Coordinates of C-alpha atoms and ligand atoms in Angstrom, one line a residue:
Chain A
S1 CA -0.1 0.0 -0.1
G2 CA 0.9 3.6 -0.2
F3 CA 0.5 6.0 -3.3
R4 CA 3.3 8.4 -4.4
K5 CA 3.8 10.7 -7.2
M6 CA 6.1 8.2 -9.0
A7 CA 8.4 8.5 -12.3
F8 CA 9.7 5.9 -14.5
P9 CA 13.0 4.5 -13.9
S10 CA 15.3 6.8 -15.6
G11 CA 18.2 4.5 -16.5
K12 CA 17.3 3.9 -20.3
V13 CA 17.1 7.7 -20.8
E14 CA 20.3 8.4 -18.7
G15 CA 22.1 6.4 -21.6
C16 CA 20.8 8.7 -24.2
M17 CA 21.9 12.2 -22.7
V18 CA 24.5 14.1 -24.3
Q19 CA 25.9 17.8 -24.3
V20 CA 25.3 20.0 -27.2
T21 CA 27.4 23.2 -27.6
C22 CA 27.1 25.7 -30.5
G23 CA 29.2 28.8 -29.8
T24 CA 28.5 30.3 -26.5
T25 CA 25.5 28.1 -25.9
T26 CA 25.2 24.9 -24.3
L27 CA 22.1 22.6 -23.6
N28 CA 21.3 18.8 -23.8
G29 CA 20.6 16.4 -26.6
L30 CA 19.0 13.0 -27.0
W31 CA 21.0 10.4 -28.9
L32 CA 19.1 7.6 -30.4
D33 CA 20.7 5.3 -33.1
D34 CA 23.1 7.8 -34.7
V35 CA 21.0 11.2 -34.4
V36 CA 21.2 13.5 -31.8
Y37 CA 18.1 15.7 -31.2
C38 CA 18.2 19.0 -29.6
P39 CA 16.4 22.4 -29.6
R40 CA 17.2 24.6 -32.5
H41 CA 17.7 27.5 -30.2
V42 CA 21.1 25.9 -29.5
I43 CA 22.3 28.3 -32.5
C44 CA 21.2 31.3 -30.7
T45 CA 22.7 33.9 -28.3
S46 CA 20.7 35.5 -25.5
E47 CA 20.2 38.6 -27.9
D48 CA 19.1 36.4 -30.8
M49 CA 16.3 34.9 -28.9
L50 CA 14.2 38.2 -29.0
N51 CA 13.8 38.0 -32.9
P52 CA 15.6 34.9 -34.1
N53 CA 15.6 34.0 -38.0
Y54 CA 16.5 30.4 -37.5
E55 CA 17.0 29.6 -41.3
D56 CA 19.3 32.6 -41.4
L57 CA 21.1 31.9 -38.3
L58 CA 21.7 28.2 -39.3
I59 CA 23.3 29.0 -42.6
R60 CA 26.4 30.2 -40.4
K61 CA 26.7 26.7 -38.7
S62 CA 28.5 23.9 -40.1
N63 CA 28.7 20.2 -38.8
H64 CA 31.9 21.1 -37.0
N65 CA 30.2 24.0 -35.2
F66 CA 28.0 21.5 -33.3
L67 CA 29.9 20.1 -30.3
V68 CA 28.5 16.9 -29.0
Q69 CA 29.9 15.3 -26.0
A70 CA 28.7 12.0 -24.4
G71 CA 30.3 11.8 -21.1
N72 CA 33.8 12.3 -21.6
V73 CA 33.8 11.3 -25.3
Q74 CA 33.4 13.6 -28.3
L75 CA 31.0 12.6 -31.0
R76 CA 31.7 13.2 -34.5
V77 CA 28.9 15.3 -36.5
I78 CA 28.4 14.2 -40.3
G79 CA 25.3 16.2 -40.8
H80 CA 22.5 18.3 -39.4
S81 CA 19.1 19.3 -40.5
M82 CA 16.3 21.5 -38.8
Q83 CA 12.8 19.8 -38.4
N84 CA 10.2 22.3 -37.1
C85 CA 12.0 23.3 -33.7
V86 CA 14.5 20.7 -33.3
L87 CA 17.8 20.0 -34.9
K88 CA 18.8 16.6 -35.8
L89 CA 22.7 16.2 -35.6
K90 CA 23.7 12.9 -37.6
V91 CA 26.7 11.7 -35.9
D92 CA 29.2 8.8 -37.2
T93 CA 28.4 6.5 -34.2
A94 CA 25.1 4.8 -33.3
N95 CA 24.4 5.0 -29.4
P96 CA 25.2 1.5 -28.0
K97 CA 22.7 2.2 -25.2
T98 CA 19.8 3.2 -27.7
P99 CA 16.6 1.5 -26.0
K100 CA 13.7 0.3 -27.9
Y101 CA 11.8 3.7 -28.4
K102 CA 9.1 5.5 -30.1
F103 CA 8.2 9.4 -30.5
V104 CA 4.7 10.1 -29.4
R105 CA 2.6 13.2 -29.3
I106 CA 0.4 13.3 -26.1
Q107 CA -2.9 14.7 -25.4
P108 CA -3.6 17.4 -22.7
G109 CA -4.1 15.5 -19.3
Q110 CA -1.6 12.7 -20.0
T111 CA 1.3 12.3 -17.7
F112 CA 5.2 11.4 -18.3
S113 CA 8.4 11.5 -16.5
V114 CA 11.0 14.3 -16.9
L115 CA 14.8 13.5 -16.6
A116 CA 15.9 17.1 -15.8
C117 CA 19.7 17.5 -17.3
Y118 CA 22.6 20.1 -17.3
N119 CA 25.5 20.0 -19.7
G120 CA 24.4 16.5 -20.9
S121 CA 24.3 15.1 -17.0
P122 CA 21.4 13.9 -15.3
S123 CA 20.2 15.8 -12.2
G124 CA 16.9 14.4 -11.1
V125 CA 13.6 12.8 -12.2
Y126 CA 10.1 13.7 -11.7
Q127 CA 6.6 13.3 -12.9
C128 CA 4.6 16.0 -15.0
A129 CA 1.4 16.3 -16.9
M130 CA 0.6 17.9 -20.1
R131 CA -1.7 20.7 -18.7
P132 CA -4.8 21.6 -20.7
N133 CA -3.3 24.9 -21.7
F134 CA -0.4 22.9 -23.2
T135 CA 2.2 24.1 -20.5
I136 CA 3.9 21.9 -18.0
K137 CA 4.8 22.7 -14.3
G138 CA 8.5 21.5 -14.3
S139 CA 11.7 22.3 -12.6
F140 CA 14.0 23.6 -15.3
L141 CA 16.9 26.0 -14.8
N142 CA 19.2 27.6 -17.6
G143 CA 21.0 24.8 -19.4
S144 CA 18.1 22.4 -18.9
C145 CA 16.6 22.8 -22.5
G146 CA 16.7 19.4 -24.3
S147 CA 15.9 17.5 -21.2
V148 CA 13.1 15.0 -22.3
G149 CA 9.7 13.6 -21.0
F150 CA 8.9 10.1 -21.7
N151 CA 6.8 7.0 -20.6
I152 CA 7.9 3.4 -20.6
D153 CA 5.7 0.3 -21.5
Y154 CA 7.7 -2.8 -20.6
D155 CA 11.0 -2.5 -22.6
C156 CA 10.0 0.5 -24.9
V157 CA 10.5 4.3 -24.0
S158 CA 8.0 6.5 -25.6
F159 CA 9.6 10.2 -25.8
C160 CA 6.9 12.9 -25.8
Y161 CA 8.3 15.9 -24.7
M162 CA 11.7 18.0 -25.2
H163 CA 12.2 21.4 -23.0
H164 CA 12.4 24.6 -24.8
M165 CA 11.2 27.7 -22.8
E166 CA 10.2 29.1 -19.7
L167 CA 7.6 31.7 -19.8
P168 CA 7.6 34.9 -17.8
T169 CA 5.0 33.2 -15.4
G170 CA 7.5 30.5 -14.7
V171 CA 5.8 27.5 -16.4
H172 CA 7.2 25.5 -19.2
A173 CA 6.9 24.8 -23.0
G174 CA 8.4 22.6 -25.2
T175 CA 7.9 20.2 -28.2
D176 CA 7.3 16.7 -29.1
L177 CA 10.4 14.8 -30.7
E178 CA 9.4 15.9 -34.2
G179 CA 10.1 19.5 -32.9
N180 CA 6.3 20.7 -33.0
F181 CA 5.4 22.7 -29.8
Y182 CA 2.7 21.6 -27.8
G183 CA 0.0 24.6 -27.6
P184 CA 0.8 27.9 -29.5
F185 CA 4.1 28.5 -28.1
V186 CA 7.2 29.5 -30.0
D187 CA 10.8 29.5 -29.4
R188 CA 11.1 33.3 -29.2
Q189 CA 11.5 35.5 -26.1
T190 CA 8.2 37.5 -26.4
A191 CA 5.0 38.1 -24.5
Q192 CA 3.6 34.5 -24.5
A193 CA 0.8 34.1 -21.9
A194 CA -0.7 30.8 -20.9
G195 CA -4.4 30.4 -20.9
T196 CA -6.6 29.0 -18.2
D197 CA -4.9 26.2 -16.0
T198 CA -8.0 23.9 -16.0
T199 CA -7.8 20.9 -13.8
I200 CA -7.9 17.5 -15.2
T201 CA -11.1 16.0 -13.9
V202 CA -10.6 12.3 -15.0
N203 CA -7.3 12.4 -13.3
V204 CA -8.8 13.7 -10.1
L205 CA -11.3 10.8 -10.1
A206 CA -8.6 8.4 -10.6
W207 CA -6.7 9.7 -7.6
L208 CA -9.8 9.5 -5.6
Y209 CA -9.9 5.8 -6.6
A210 CA -6.3 5.4 -5.5
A211 CA -7.1 7.0 -2.2
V212 CA -10.1 4.5 -1.6
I213 CA -7.8 1.6 -2.6
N214 CA -5.2 2.7 -0.2
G215 CA -7.5 3.5 2.8
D216 CA -8.5 7.0 2.5
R217 CA -12.3 7.0 2.2
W218 CA -13.8 9.9 4.6
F219 CA -14.9 11.8 1.2
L220 CA -17.4 9.1 0.2
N221 CA -20.8 10.1 0.5
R222 CA -24.5 9.2 0.2
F223 CA -24.9 11.0 -3.1
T224 CA -24.9 10.3 -7.0
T225 CA -25.0 12.6 -9.9
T226 CA -25.2 12.8 -13.6
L227 CA -22.7 13.7 -16.2
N228 CA -24.4 16.8 -17.0
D229 CA -25.1 17.9 -13.5
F230 CA -21.7 17.2 -12.5
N231 CA -20.2 19.3 -15.4
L232 CA -22.3 22.5 -14.1
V233 CA -20.0 22.2 -11.1
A234 CA -16.9 21.3 -13.1
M235 CA -17.4 24.5 -15.2
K236 CA -17.6 26.7 -12.2
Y237 CA -14.4 25.2 -10.8
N238 CA -12.5 25.5 -14.1
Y239 CA -12.4 21.7 -14.3
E240 CA -12.6 19.9 -17.7
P241 CA -15.9 18.6 -18.6
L242 CA -16.2 14.9 -18.0
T243 CA -17.2 12.9 -20.9
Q244 CA -18.4 9.3 -21.6
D245 CA -15.0 8.5 -22.8
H246 CA -13.8 9.4 -19.4
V247 CA -16.4 7.3 -17.4
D248 CA -15.4 4.4 -19.7
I249 CA -11.7 4.8 -19.0
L250 CA -12.6 4.7 -15.3
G251 CA -14.6 1.4 -15.6
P252 CA -11.9 -0.7 -14.4
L253 CA -11.1 1.2 -11.1
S254 CA -14.9 1.3 -10.7
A255 CA -14.9 -2.4 -11.0
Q256 CA -12.1 -2.8 -8.4
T257 CA -13.4 -0.7 -5.7
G258 CA -17.4 -1.4 -6.5
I259 CA -18.0 2.6 -6.5
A260 CA -19.8 3.7 -9.6
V261 CA -18.1 6.3 -11.4
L262 CA -21.0 8.8 -11.1
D263 CA -21.0 8.2 -7.3
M264 CA -17.3 9.2 -7.1
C265 CA -18.4 12.2 -9.2
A266 CA -20.8 13.0 -6.5
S267 CA -18.0 12.8 -3.9
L268 CA -15.8 15.1 -6.0
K269 CA -18.7 17.5 -6.6
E270 CA -19.0 17.7 -2.7
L271 CA -15.3 18.2 -2.0
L272 CA -15.4 21.0 -4.7
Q273 CA -18.3 22.8 -2.9
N274 CA -17.3 22.4 0.4
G275 CA -13.4 22.1 0.2
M276 CA -11.6 19.6 2.4
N277 CA -12.2 21.3 5.9
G278 CA -8.5 20.9 6.8
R279 CA -8.3 17.3 6.1
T280 CA -6.0 15.3 3.7
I281 CA -6.3 12.7 0.8
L282 CA -3.3 10.6 0.2
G283 CA -1.3 13.2 2.1
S284 CA -2.6 16.1 -0.2
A285 CA -4.6 19.1 1.0
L286 CA -5.7 19.7 -2.6
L287 CA -7.1 17.7 -5.4
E288 CA -4.3 16.2 -7.3
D289 CA -4.9 15.8 -11.1
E290 CA -1.4 14.6 -12.4
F291 CA -2.3 11.0 -12.2
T292 CA -4.2 9.1 -15.0
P293 CA -6.3 6.2 -14.5
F294 CA -3.7 4.0 -16.2
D295 CA -1.1 5.5 -13.7
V296 CA -3.2 4.5 -10.7
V297 CA -3.8 1.0 -12.0
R298 CA -0.1 0.5 -12.6
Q299 CA 1.1 1.8 -9.4
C300 CA -1.5 -0.2 -7.7
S301 CA -0.7 -3.4 -9.3
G302 CA 3.0 -3.3 -9.6
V303 CA 3.7 -3.3 -13.3
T304 CA 7.5 -3.4 -14.0
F305 CA 9.9 -2.6 -17.0
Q306 CA 12.2 -4.9 -19.0
Chain B
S1 CA 12.7 28.1 -12.2
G2 CA 10.1 25.7 -10.8
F3 CA 10.3 23.5 -7.9
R4 CA 9.3 19.8 -7.8
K5 CA 9.6 16.7 -5.4
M6 CA 12.6 15.2 -7.6
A7 CA 14.2 11.9 -7.2
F8 CA 17.7 11.0 -8.1
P9 CA 18.3 9.5 -11.5
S10 CA 17.9 5.6 -10.9
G11 CA 20.0 4.0 -13.7
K12 CA 22.9 3.2 -11.2
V13 CA 20.6 1.4 -8.9
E14 CA 18.6 -0.3 -11.6
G15 CA 21.9 -2.0 -12.8
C16 CA 22.0 -3.5 -9.2
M17 CA 18.5 -5.1 -8.8
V18 CA 18.1 -8.8 -8.9
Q19 CA 15.2 -11.2 -8.1
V20 CA 15.8 -13.6 -5.0
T21 CA 13.4 -16.7 -4.5
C22 CA 13.7 -19.0 -1.5
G23 CA 11.0 -21.6 -1.6
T24 CA 7.6 -20.1 -2.2
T25 CA 8.7 -16.4 -1.4
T26 CA 10.0 -13.9 -4.0
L27 CA 11.5 -10.4 -3.4
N28 CA 14.4 -8.0 -4.6
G29 CA 18.0 -8.2 -4.0
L30 CA 20.8 -5.6 -4.3
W31 CA 23.8 -6.9 -6.3
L32 CA 27.2 -5.1 -5.5
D33 CA 30.6 -6.6 -6.4
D34 CA 29.8 -10.3 -5.6
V35 CA 27.2 -9.9 -2.9
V36 CA 23.5 -10.1 -3.0
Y37 CA 21.9 -8.2 -0.2
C38 CA 18.3 -9.0 0.7
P39 CA 15.7 -9.2 3.7
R40 CA 16.2 -12.3 5.7
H41 CA 12.4 -12.9 5.6
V42 CA 12.9 -14.4 2.1
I43 CA 13.3 -17.5 4.1
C44 CA 9.9 -17.1 5.5
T45 CA 6.4 -18.3 4.7
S46 CA 3.6 -16.0 5.5
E47 CA 2.7 -18.4 8.3
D48 CA 6.4 -18.1 9.7
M49 CA 6.2 -14.3 9.7
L50 CA 3.9 -14.4 12.9
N51 CA 6.7 -15.8 15.0
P52 CA 9.9 -16.4 13.1
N53 CA 13.2 -18.2 14.6
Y54 CA 15.4 -16.8 11.8
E55 CA 18.5 -18.8 13.0
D56 CA 16.5 -22.1 13.0
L57 CA 14.8 -21.3 9.7
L58 CA 18.1 -20.5 8.1
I59 CA 19.6 -23.9 9.2
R60 CA 17.3 -25.7 6.6
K61 CA 18.5 -23.5 3.8
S62 CA 21.6 -24.2 1.6
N63 CA 23.2 -22.1 -1.0
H64 CA 21.3 -23.6 -3.7
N65 CA 18.0 -22.8 -2.2
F66 CA 18.4 -19.2 -2.9
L67 CA 17.8 -18.6 -6.5
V68 CA 19.1 -15.3 -7.7
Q69 CA 18.1 -14.0 -11.2
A70 CA 19.5 -10.9 -12.8
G71 CA 17.3 -10.3 -15.8
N72 CA 17.2 -13.5 -17.5
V73 CA 20.4 -14.9 -16.4
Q74 CA 21.0 -17.0 -13.2
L75 CA 23.7 -16.2 -10.5
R76 CA 25.4 -19.0 -9.0
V77 CA 25.3 -18.7 -5.1
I78 CA 28.7 -19.8 -3.3
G79 CA 27.9 -18.7 0.3
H80 CA 25.3 -16.9 2.5
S81 CA 25.3 -15.4 5.9
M82 CA 22.9 -13.5 8.1
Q83 CA 23.9 -10.0 9.2
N84 CA 21.3 -8.6 11.5
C85 CA 18.1 -8.5 9.3
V86 CA 19.6 -9.0 5.9
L87 CA 21.1 -11.9 4.2
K88 CA 24.3 -11.4 2.2
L89 CA 24.4 -14.0 -0.6
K90 CA 28.0 -14.5 -2.0
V91 CA 27.6 -15.1 -5.8
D92 CA 30.5 -16.2 -8.2
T93 CA 30.3 -13.1 -10.4
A94 CA 31.1 -9.4 -9.5
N95 CA 28.2 -7.3 -10.8
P96 CA 29.8 -5.6 -13.8
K97 CA 27.5 -2.6 -13.3
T98 CA 28.5 -1.9 -9.8
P99 CA 28.8 1.9 -9.2
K100 CA 30.9 3.6 -6.7
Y101 CA 28.9 3.1 -3.5
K102 CA 28.8 3.4 0.2
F103 CA 26.5 2.3 2.8
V104 CA 25.1 5.0 5.0
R105 CA 22.9 5.0 8.0
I106 CA 20.8 8.3 7.9
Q107 CA 19.1 10.2 10.4
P108 CA 15.6 11.0 10.7
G109 CA 14.8 14.1 8.6
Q110 CA 17.1 13.2 5.8
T111 CA 15.7 12.4 2.4
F112 CA 16.3 9.9 -0.2
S113 CA 15.1 8.2 -3.4
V114 CA 13.3 4.8 -3.5
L115 CA 13.5 2.5 -6.5
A116 CA 10.3 0.4 -6.2
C117 CA 10.8 -3.1 -7.6
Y118 CA 8.9 -6.2 -8.0
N119 CA 10.8 -9.5 -9.1
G120 CA 14.0 -7.9 -9.5
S121 CA 12.5 -5.3 -12.0
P122 CA 12.2 -1.5 -11.6
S123 CA 8.5 -0.2 -11.3
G124 CA 9.2 3.5 -10.4
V125 CA 11.1 6.0 -8.7
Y126 CA 10.1 8.5 -6.0
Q127 CA 11.5 10.6 -3.1
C128 CA 10.9 9.8 0.7
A129 CA 12.1 11.1 4.0
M130 CA 13.0 9.1 6.9
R131 CA 10.3 10.4 9.4
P132 CA 11.0 11.4 13.1
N133 CA 9.2 8.1 14.1
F134 CA 11.5 6.1 11.9
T135 CA 8.7 5.2 9.3
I136 CA 8.8 6.1 5.8
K137 CA 5.6 6.9 3.7
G138 CA 6.2 4.8 0.6
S139 CA 4.5 3.1 -2.1
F140 CA 5.2 -0.8 -1.6
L141 CA 3.1 -3.6 -2.5
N142 CA 3.6 -7.4 -2.0
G143 CA 6.9 -8.4 -3.5
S144 CA 8.6 -4.9 -3.1
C145 CA 10.7 -5.9 -0.3
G146 CA 14.4 -5.6 -1.0
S147 CA 13.8 -2.3 -2.8
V148 CA 16.3 0.2 -1.8
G149 CA 16.6 3.7 -0.9
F150 CA 19.6 5.9 -1.9
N151 CA 21.3 9.2 -2.4
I152 CA 23.9 10.1 -5.2
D153 CA 26.8 12.6 -4.6
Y154 CA 28.4 12.9 -8.1
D155 CA 29.6 9.4 -9.0
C156 CA 28.9 7.7 -5.7
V157 CA 25.5 5.9 -4.6
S158 CA 25.1 6.1 -0.9
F159 CA 22.5 3.3 0.0
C160 CA 20.7 4.1 3.2
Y161 CA 17.5 2.1 3.2
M162 CA 16.1 -1.6 2.2
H163 CA 12.3 -2.1 2.5
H164 CA 11.2 -4.9 4.8
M165 CA 7.7 -4.3 6.4
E166 CA 4.2 -2.6 6.0
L167 CA 2.7 -1.8 9.5
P168 CA -1.0 -2.2 9.7
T169 CA -1.3 1.6 9.4
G170 CA 0.0 1.6 5.9
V171 CA 3.3 3.2 6.7
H172 CA 6.8 1.4 6.0
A173 CA 9.6 0.2 7.9
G174 CA 13.0 -1.2 6.8
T175 CA 16.7 -1.2 7.5
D176 CA 20.0 0.2 6.5
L177 CA 22.4 -1.9 4.5
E178 CA 24.0 -3.6 7.2
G179 CA 20.5 -4.9 8.3
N180 CA 19.7 -2.9 11.2
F181 CA 16.1 -1.6 11.4
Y182 CA 15.5 2.3 11.6
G183 CA 13.5 2.8 15.0
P184 CA 12.3 0.0 17.1
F185 CA 10.6 -2.1 14.3
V186 CA 11.4 -5.8 13.9
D187 CA 10.7 -8.4 11.0
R188 CA 7.9 -10.0 12.6
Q189 CA 4.0 -9.6 11.8
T190 CA 2.9 -8.4 15.1
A191 CA 1.5 -5.3 16.8
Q192 CA 4.0 -2.6 15.9
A193 CA 2.4 0.9 16.3
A194 CA 4.4 4.0 14.8
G195 CA 4.9 6.9 17.5
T196 CA 3.9 10.5 16.4
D197 CA 4.4 11.5 13.0
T198 CA 6.3 14.9 13.7
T199 CA 6.9 17.5 11.1
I200 CA 10.5 18.0 10.1
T201 CA 10.8 21.8 11.0
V202 CA 14.2 22.6 9.2
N203 CA 12.7 21.0 6.0
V204 CA 9.6 23.1 6.2
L205 CA 11.9 26.2 6.4
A206 CA 14.1 25.0 3.6
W207 CA 10.9 24.6 1.5
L208 CA 9.7 28.0 2.4
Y209 CA 13.1 29.4 1.1
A210 CA 12.7 27.4 -2.2
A211 CA 9.3 29.2 -2.5
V212 CA 10.7 32.5 -2.2
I213 CA 13.5 31.9 -4.8
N214 CA 10.9 30.4 -7.2
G215 CA 8.5 33.3 -6.9
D216 CA 5.8 32.4 -4.0
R217 CA 6.2 35.0 -1.3
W218 CA 2.7 35.9 0.1
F219 CA 3.4 34.4 3.4
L220 CA 6.3 36.6 4.1
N221 CA 5.4 39.0 7.1
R222 CA 6.6 41.8 9.1
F223 CA 7.7 39.9 12.1
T224 CA 10.4 38.0 13.6
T225 CA 10.8 35.5 16.5
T226 CA 13.4 33.9 18.7
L227 CA 14.1 30.1 18.7
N228 CA 12.6 29.7 22.0
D229 CA 9.4 31.7 21.2
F230 CA 9.2 29.6 17.7
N231 CA 9.6 26.4 19.5
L232 CA 6.7 27.0 21.9
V233 CA 4.4 27.0 18.8
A234 CA 6.5 23.8 17.3
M235 CA 5.5 22.0 20.2
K236 CA 2.0 22.8 19.8
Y237 CA 1.7 21.7 16.1
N238 CA 3.9 18.5 16.8
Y239 CA 6.8 20.1 15.0
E240 CA 10.4 19.1 15.9
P241 CA 12.2 21.7 17.9
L242 CA 14.5 24.0 15.8
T243 CA 18.1 24.0 17.1
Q244 CA 21.0 26.4 16.6
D245 CA 22.5 23.5 14.4
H246 CA 19.4 23.9 12.2
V247 CA 19.7 27.6 11.8
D248 CA 23.4 27.1 10.8
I249 CA 22.4 24.8 8.3
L250 CA 20.0 27.2 6.7
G251 CA 22.7 29.7 6.5
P252 CA 23.3 29.6 2.8
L253 CA 19.7 29.9 1.9
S254 CA 19.3 32.8 4.3
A255 CA 22.3 34.4 2.4
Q256 CA 21.0 33.9 -1.0
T257 CA 17.4 35.4 -0.1
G258 CA 18.4 38.0 2.3
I259 CA 15.7 36.7 4.7
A260 CA 17.0 36.1 8.1
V261 CA 16.3 32.6 9.3
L262 CA 14.3 33.7 12.4
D263 CA 12.3 36.1 10.1
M264 CA 11.1 32.9 8.1
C265 CA 10.6 31.1 11.5
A266 CA 8.0 34.1 12.0
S267 CA 6.6 33.4 8.7
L268 CA 6.2 29.8 9.5
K269 CA 4.6 30.5 12.9
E270 CA 1.9 32.6 11.1
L271 CA 1.2 30.0 8.8
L272 CA 0.8 27.5 11.7
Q273 CA -1.3 29.6 13.6
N274 CA -3.5 30.8 10.9
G275 CA -3.3 28.3 8.2
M276 CA -3.0 29.2 4.5
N277 CA -6.5 30.6 4.1
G278 CA -7.1 28.4 0.9
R279 CA -3.8 29.6 -0.8
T280 CA -1.1 27.4 -2.1
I281 CA 2.9 27.6 -1.7
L282 CA 4.6 25.7 -4.8
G283 CA 1.6 24.0 -5.5
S284 CA 0.9 22.5 -2.3
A285 CA -1.9 23.3 0.3
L286 CA -0.1 22.2 3.2
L287 CA 3.6 22.8 4.7
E288 CA 5.9 20.3 2.9
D289 CA 8.8 18.9 4.9
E290 CA 10.3 16.2 3.0
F291 CA 12.9 18.7 1.1
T292 CA 16.1 19.2 3.0
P293 CA 18.1 22.3 2.9
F294 CA 20.7 20.7 0.6
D295 CA 17.9 19.2 -1.5
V296 CA 16.7 22.8 -2.0
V297 CA 20.4 24.2 -2.8
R298 CA 20.9 21.3 -5.2
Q299 CA 17.8 21.5 -7.2
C300 CA 17.9 25.3 -7.3
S301 CA 21.6 25.2 -8.5
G302 CA 21.3 22.5 -11.0
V303 CA 23.8 19.9 -9.5
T304 CA 24.4 16.9 -11.6
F305 CA 25.8 13.4 -11.3
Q306 CA 28.7 11.5 -13.1
Ligands
S8T1 C1 16.7 26.5 -21.8 C2 17.0 27.2 -22.9 C3 17.9 28.7 -23.0 C4 18.7 29.0 -24.1 C5 19.5 30.1 -24.1 C6 20.2 30.7 -25.3 C7 20.1 32.1 -25.7 C8 19.9 29.8 -26.6 C9 19.5 31.0 -23.0 C10 18.8 30.6 -21.9 C11 18.0 29.5 -21.9 S1 17.4 29.4 -20.3 C12 16.2 28.1 -19.9 C13 15.4 28.5 -18.7 C14 14.5 27.5 -18.3 F1 13.6 27.7 -17.2 C15 14.1 26.5 -19.0 C16 14.9 26.0 -20.1 C17 16.1 26.9 -20.6
S8T2 C1 7.4 -7.3 1.5 C2 7.8 -8.5 2.3 C3 6.8 -9.8 2.2 C4 7.2 -11.1 2.4 C5 6.2 -12.0 2.9 C6 6.9 -13.5 3.0 C7 6.1 -14.2 4.0 C8 8.3 -13.4 3.5 C9 5.0 -11.9 2.4 C10 4.7 -10.7 2.2 C11 5.4 -9.5 1.9 S1 4.4 -8.2 1.8 C12 5.1 -6.4 1.6 C13 4.1 -5.7 1.6 C14 4.5 -4.3 1.6 F1 3.5 -3.5 1.7 C15 5.8 -3.8 1.5 C16 6.7 -5.1 1.4 C17 6.5 -6.2 1.4

């Protein structure tokens, strides 16, 4: 028993992290097979970031201007290209530690692990969610760009995020591994504001199920609700609307606990209307929304990775 | 910017995890050089755990009764011994992935990362603290025993915890890697109750510093206090007494922020007396106490590991 905000084991990704330096600028890259993926703004100075013309800045760069270092060993760059907002640096050596992997573009509400790195070296691992406004709430200092987010299914790493930007409000924006930003964000130092940070309703419900499983049940009540009635409260509290698809996804947790999804919605509705009255749920005094239903099932079942 | 509950990169420890089976019972072991460390209750059945005589149960076990598997490859056991509450299984092959390591016995209030494993396979990583009552609040299902807790300084893994028991109240107990339990707990299925779960005051103060650094400052007030006056409030709220040693440890965070330690104590005192009035600090609605001062400095500075 016990329920913790739990990241995937990070070793498979650690083996892929390298340093990339272009002129004055150093950040992180991801070495898979014979390609190193990194943010294209490695080519920019701080000045350039106000108004960069990436294609023009790139003209002045040759393969030998991209210094790529894997631990203590230098990699030879034999080609480079820009794809959307990432550079692909072809090197002459396949990474011997390349895991089975996929590139995935995740949907808002999905969770993933981040391996925060500096100078190609891992500093720590933590769990994030893609927020409904397409930001993430991470921990990224200068030099962390190129750190990645990922999920693992058994033996296969699904990379879903690369870090590129901190907004002035302190939240974080980045791309998939094809270099397309999540949301409307651009790799420019401008006024980019995030929209409403709505709460991921299906994840809160999953977490309430996790609570019940792991002993915390004070919030269960005598009531039920309907999808439309619940969503009238969701809107008021800036929660995502709950859909039939969400109910279906919660089916397995409903079956394990015997608590109908709509009954748990009535519990959540009461918590939103009345607060927690100074009580806690799984050690938190607010409603946690960065566990997916699949996260709850996995952690409560002990699924492992090859 | 951003501040997250952040675990150490887990790869160095992943490479040390093995499966240990004795008769009917399977749990995890830690393979360093040519020794596998695991909980001695691998030799017990569920029945045995009510009242085990470990020395008597061990007499019936030979080297070939301890099945040790590292991924798909079986290790040959050439000797075994019991040290306190762990078994040391000597195998004929040194782990080629052995990192630089130390065994450390930590003090209450110190934090560490846990690599939760099942059947020798990693499932996830998260950050814990040794509570003042010598429990930890983990996420451990049946089969997780032998999972370890650790810290990393650059290239060297300091192992500090091995998981052995879940108390009836759902919190967790275990040993250092010499097999000595933290606190009064024993590897028996009995009535073992945990004492008061007091809050780690110096860690809360460190976390308030982290908040100020990362933008959250609404709780700063016009007041100061003294150690003795603050501790009169600490006692009331089941917080550890703050000592001069603690103040000294917070010195560097005091210097970076310009907020005197005793001024931050006055902020904390107001938060304890008045609550948070429905506000949040670094995304939490309660006072977080599982970040040490060194954790805050590390995460806010971007320290990395070899
Ligand atoms: C990473 C990216 C970054 C790039 C540059 C150069 C001008 C290209 C300067 C500064 C940064 S700072 C940064 C800050 C964060 F909070 C997260 C990621 C980065
Ligand atoms: C791990 C240890 C464990 C051992 C046995 C045998 C009888 C030796 C049975 C059950 C367990 S269950 C367990 C449960 C937890 F929550 C955490 C660790 C273990």
